[PDB]
């Protein structure tokens, strides 16, 4: 299962930008897509999101006006239109595929590699700026959120490697995606979360994000994002 996005774009500001999102091995019809960016050296930003075979969508708060999210289903095409343009907008722009695994019935989410668009603050979950060890410890990393969101909602992990799209780590609080080793698990309990990493090895050396749904601003939060260091010490 692929995802073609369109290429960089580099906008003056004022103008507006509309980026694609192609799905391969499969309409499509099945899934939501979201969209989310990521500014250079910054952590994780939702933008919005759609299900397609509904036709609706749904937008974050920050951005309501600007974002224009649209489906084409015959070409199981997505697209993202953000007008309006200035330097803050600077991001790599990513598409995400989510919904539910055919047969076995659960969870995945899948990201594309991302659209650079260069031209010319909102509520995050709290986790700790940074985290270390040595290899073959253990490490701990923490999400704290409130009632409307951890509280009540499922906490996903993301692991993102420097010059790499996130990737799913944890989902549903504790459940590992296949490809994932037992080495990590997630936790959470009342309005805290919390990814546990045994044996460490120095291919974890990465960003770590949590995030979760928000019945409040009705949108996704992703938290502040911790850097885990392994100390070849
Ligand atoms: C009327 C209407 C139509 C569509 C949407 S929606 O596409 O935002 N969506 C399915 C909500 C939702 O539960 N998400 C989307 C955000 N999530 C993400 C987003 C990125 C990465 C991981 N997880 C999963 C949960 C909301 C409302």
């Known amino acids: 299962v692929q995802l073609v996005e369109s290429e960089a774009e580099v906008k003056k500001p004022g103008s507006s930008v509309k980026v694609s999102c192609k799905a391969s091995?499969?309409?499509?019809?099945?899934?939501?897509i979201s969209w989310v960016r990521q500014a250079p050296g910054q952590g994780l930003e939702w933008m919005g999101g759609?299900?397609?075979?509904?036709?609706?969508?749904d937008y974050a708060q920050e951005f309501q006006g600007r974002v224009t999210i649209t489906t084409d289903e015959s070409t199981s095409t997505a697209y993202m239109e953000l007008s309006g343009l200035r330097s803050e907008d600077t991001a790599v722009y990513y598409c995400?595929?989510?919904?539910?695994?055919?047969?076995?019935?659960?969870?995945?989410?899948?990201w594309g590699q991302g659209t650079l668009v260069t031209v010319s603050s909102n509520f995050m979950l709290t986790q700790p700026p940074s985290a270390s060890g040595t290899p073959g410890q253990s490490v701990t990393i923490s999400c704290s959120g409130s009632?409307?969101?951890?509280?009540?909602?499922?906490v996903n992990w993301y692991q993102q490697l420097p010059g790499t799209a996130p990737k799913l780590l944890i989902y549903?609080?504790?459940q590992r995606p296949s490809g994932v080793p037992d080495r990590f698990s997630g936790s959470k309990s009342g309005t805290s979360a919390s990814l546990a990493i045994s044996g460490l090895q120095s291919e974890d050396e990465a960003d770590y994000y949590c995030?979760?749904?928000?019945?409040?601003?009705?949108?996704?939060?992703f938290g502040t994002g911790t850097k885990l260091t392994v100390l070849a010490a």
């Open positions: 995400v595929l989510l919904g539910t695994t055919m047969v076995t019935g659960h969870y995945f989410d899948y």
């Open positions: 091995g499969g309409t499509f019809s099945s899934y939501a």
């Open positions: 759609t299900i397609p075979i509904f036709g609706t969508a």
């Open positions: 009632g409307s969101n951890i509280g009540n909602n499922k």
């Open positions: 549903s609080n504790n």
């Open positions: 995030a979760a749904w928000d019945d409040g601003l009705s949108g996704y939060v």
